[PDB]
Amino acid sequence: DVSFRLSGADPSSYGMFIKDLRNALPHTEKVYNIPLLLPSVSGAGRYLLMHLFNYDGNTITVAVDVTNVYIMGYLALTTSYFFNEPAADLASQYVFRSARRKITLPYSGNYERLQIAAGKPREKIPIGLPALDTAISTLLHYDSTAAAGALLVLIQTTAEAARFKYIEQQIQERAYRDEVPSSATISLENSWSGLSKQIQLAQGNNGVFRTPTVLVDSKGNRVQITNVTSNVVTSNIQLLLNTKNI
Numbered sequence: 246d247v248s249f250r251l252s253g254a255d256p257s258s259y260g261m262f263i264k265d266l267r268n269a270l271p272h273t274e275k276v277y278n279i280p281l282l283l284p285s286v287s288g289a290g291r292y293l294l295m296h297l298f299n300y301d302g303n304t305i306t307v308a309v310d311v312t313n314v315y316i317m318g319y320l321a322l323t324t325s326y327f328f329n330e331p332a333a334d335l336a337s338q339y340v341f342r343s344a345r346r347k348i349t350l351p352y353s354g355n356y357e358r359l360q361i362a363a364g365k366p367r368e369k370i371p372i373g374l375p376a377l378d379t380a381i382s383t384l385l386h387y388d389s390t391a392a393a394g395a396l397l398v399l400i401q402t403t404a405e406a407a408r409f410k411y412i413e414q415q416i417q418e419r420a421y422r423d424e425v426p427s428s429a430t431i432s433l434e435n436s437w438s439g440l441s442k443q444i445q446l447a448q449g450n451n452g453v454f455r456t457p458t459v460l461v462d463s464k465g466n467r468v469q470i471t472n473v474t475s476n477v478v479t480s481n482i483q484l485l486l487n488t489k490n491i
């Protein structure tokens with residue numbers, strides 16, 4: 246299991262937690278030097294448990310699917326909360342079984358559905374470590390509308406940071422001050438799948454992408470990624486969703 250305590254957290258400890266998270270994910274092979282995530286895994290070994298502690302010491306345990314890094318649900322004291330979707334439901338059979346009651350949230354865990362339930366797109370929700378602290382706080386006591394917002398912050402300050410060096414860096418800059426995400430961040434978040442597929446399709450194609458991937462950069466200018474020599478591939482992305490899942 247991996248743990249992170251917001252109390253006494255600085256950019257450095259966060260970096261270590263995200264490194265720990267990355268190393269918690271299994272993989273047998275690397276593609277162009279980046280860990281390729283497993284196609285599938287059997288039983289309880291498919292889920293990673295994250296223990297998160299807010300500033301006051303309260304905690305929630307989050308269950309993450311190790312083949313994609315998707316959050317499936319979490320535990321607050323004695324109530325387990327799971328997304329309203331098949332995979333999440335499958336996940337309820339191996340984790341948080343000793344919970345007194347299990348609640349199914351009224352939405353599945355994809356950005357589109359979470360942004361609807363939250364009432365705002367993630368362009369306008371501030372993220373950072375202070376926000377993570379709030380997120381944890383908000384999940385300790387049920388409120389489907391509040392949880393949507395908190396989960397959008399949680400998914401990004403953990404899963405998305407794990408997948409992209411850039412996003413981990415964005416969060417370290419927001420260690421004592423929240424700030425809405427840059428469009429580069431949103432763009433990356435949205436391309437993890439495409440990039441993952443294209444970096445794999447370049448393996449028997451001299452490192453050249455079958456189809457170019459379009460992102461928005463630091464400045465907000467539209468850019469095209471056609472090949473693995475790009476910074477995004479050489480230095481940004483840290484995990485690859487196996488094509489068997491796309």
Ligand SMILES: *[C@@H]1O[C@H](CO)[C@@H](O[C@@H]2O[C@H](CO)[C@@H](O)[C@H](O)[C@H]2NC(C)=O)[C@H](O)[C@H]1NC(C)=O
Binds near residue numbers: 474476
């Ligand atoms: C692969 O991507 C690189 C960019 O990392 C392309 O780079 C060209 O050369 C410089 C720096 O590498 C770029 O800024 C230029 O805009 C590019 N000029 C060209 C040749 O178009 C490189 O071209 C790409 N190579 C491919 C497509 O195999």
Ligand SMILES: Cn1cnc2nc(N)[nH]c(=O)c21
Binds near residue numbers: 314315333353356
């Ligand atoms: C980032 N992301 C995209 N679809 C997702 N679906 C679930 N269930 N959890 C996630 O963290 C997620």
